[PDB]
């Protein structure tokens, strides 16, 4: 029972935004670390719901700062294949392994739920300061894979932060996105838009606007 050691494998999902926009390229990434100089050859086998595919691209060996090798294989996935819950398996073979290592990843299971998006103006207590906070409340979505952005007048906003998805009591997720703008931009009536991308939305997106207009 003395065959411990050898490389390790980590399998990563595609970015949520790449699976939702048909123009982008969603990819699953199989990363092999702790590859020795004595046994540097790594072999990748890719499977989609059990059947093998051969279109993945393997990057050449790259020596890390700890004198080990790191080998990465990238598999382009079809947008609807990932969204429909297909399983992606990476099988890694190397002479230093007693048996190939298999890692499987797929989208979180469960019925998708449409997010509700609400924009909230700054609190009147914050108007005394030089920069105000614009809030985008996104709640009730499942799975937690989502992308949130801000823009105004056809240009992205350069100063916003979004909290991680938080599990709500009903099994769905929620988050908040805080856009920080100069108070003058807000009081001058500029229109700011919160764009939310999620598979449960029509055309995989919705956007809600926010502007100073009590008068």
């Amino acid at each position: 029972p003395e065959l411990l050691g050898g490389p390790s494998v980590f399998l990563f999902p595609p970015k949520p935004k790449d699976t939702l926009m048909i123009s982008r390229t969603p990819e699953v990434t199989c990363v092999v670390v702790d590859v020795s100089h004595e046994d540097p050859e790594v072999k990748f086998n890719w499977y989609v719901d059990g059947v093998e595919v051969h279109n993945a691209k393997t990057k050449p060996r790259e020596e890390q700062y700890n004198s080990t090798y790191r080998v990465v294989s990238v598999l382009t996935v079809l947008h609807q294949d990932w969204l429909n819950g297909k399983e992606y398996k990476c099988k890694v073979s190397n002479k230093a392994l007693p048996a190939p290592i298999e890692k499987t990843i797929s989208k979180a299971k469960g019925q998708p739920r449409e997010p509700q998006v609400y924009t909230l103006p700054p609190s009147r207590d914050e108007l005394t300061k030089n920069q105000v906070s614009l809030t985008c409340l996104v709640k009730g979505f499942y799975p937690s894979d989502i992308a949130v952005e801000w823009e105004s007048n056809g240009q992205p906003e350069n100063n916003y932060k979004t909290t991680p998805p938080v599990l709500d009591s009903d099994g769905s997720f929620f988050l908040y996105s805080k856009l920080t703008v100069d108070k003058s931009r807000w009081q001058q009536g500029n229109v700011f838009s919160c764009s939310v991308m999620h598979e449960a939305l029509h055309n995989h997106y919705t956007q809600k606007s926010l502007s100073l207009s009590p008068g």
């Binding site: 411990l4 050691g5 050898g6 702790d34 020795s36 700062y65 700890n66 004198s67 080990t68 230093a96």
Partner: protein, 262 residues
């Protein structure tokens, strides 16, 4: 008479608590039935056999050991350290000269198993082993000096403390000076020189130099330090290079290009 010499078996200068190590007092002129004087930090040890065995190491065994037998001079000190911990980076020597091999070992407490071992030099891991293995650097140079430690994966990943190793340089790069200035009249004698000299006090050591021009050899390994062209016609002209090394050649160093014109 020459000095006595202490040898360690195993050669590791650092051991764990309750581990064993035997010290060997070697004298060149082989004696018969003569007492051996052992010293720990200058204090006489009550053991007179030619070897000294530590059966269960403790902190009381740490320090400098010296030995002497017969008409020999007292040995140079060997420093033994006793440690407690998960991993211990064991070295065969704390101070070395260029060209002398260095042995490293990532030793696990109670001879337990670790895998995916990393050997570190000055904070950077330079060697990785899937299964725990010793590491030997045969042709050492000054770049191999520094603080060494190791890490290995057992139930958790464990890391040893550091230990410093110095590899002292023997002679600098033998730059090739130019005595006669270039250009120069066809017909004037030239005096070539290879500029390097020792750094340590090595009594019985002599460097042997070799003068090159381009790639063709001119004078091989010779005890002399100067290439003597009788009187210069400048087909013996161009990029001249020198090389200085030990007689065993285990440390070799080059020269900068001396573009000579006569």
């Amino acid at each position: 008479a020459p000095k006595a010499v202490i040898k360690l078996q195993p050669p590791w200068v650092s051991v764990f608590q309750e581990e064993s190590v035997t010290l060997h007092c070697e004298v060149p002129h082989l004696p018969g039935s003569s007492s051996t004087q052992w010293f720990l930090n200058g204090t006489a040890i009550q053991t007179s056999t030619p070897t000294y065995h530590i059966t269960s190491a403790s902190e009381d065994d740490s320090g400098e050991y010296r030995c002497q037998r017969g008409l020999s001079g007292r040995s140079d000190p060997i420093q033994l350290e006793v440690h407690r911990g998960w991993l211990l980076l064991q070295v065969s020597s704390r101070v070395l000269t260029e060209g002398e091999p260095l042995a490293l070992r990532c030793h696990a407490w109670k001879d337990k198993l670790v895998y995916n071992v990393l050997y570190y030099r000055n904070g950077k891991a330079f060697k990785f082993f899937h299964w725990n293995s010793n590491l030997t650097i045969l042709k050492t140079n000054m770049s191999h000096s520094g603080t060494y430690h190791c890490s290995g994966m057992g139930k958790r990943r464990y890391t040893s403390a550091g230990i410093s190793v110095t590899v002292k340089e023997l002679f600098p790069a033998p730059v090739l000076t130019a005595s006669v200035t270039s250009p120069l009249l066809e017909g004037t004698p030239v005096t070539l020189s290879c500029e390097t000299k020792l750094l340590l006090q090595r009594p019985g050591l002599q460097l042997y130099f070799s003068f090159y021009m381009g790639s063709k050899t001119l004078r091989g390994r010779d005890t002399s330090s100067e290439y003597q062209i009788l009187t210069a016609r400048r087909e013996d002209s161009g990029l001249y290079w020198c090389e200085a090394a030990t007689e065993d050649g285990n440390v070799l160093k080059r020269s900068p290009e001396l573009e000579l014109q006569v």
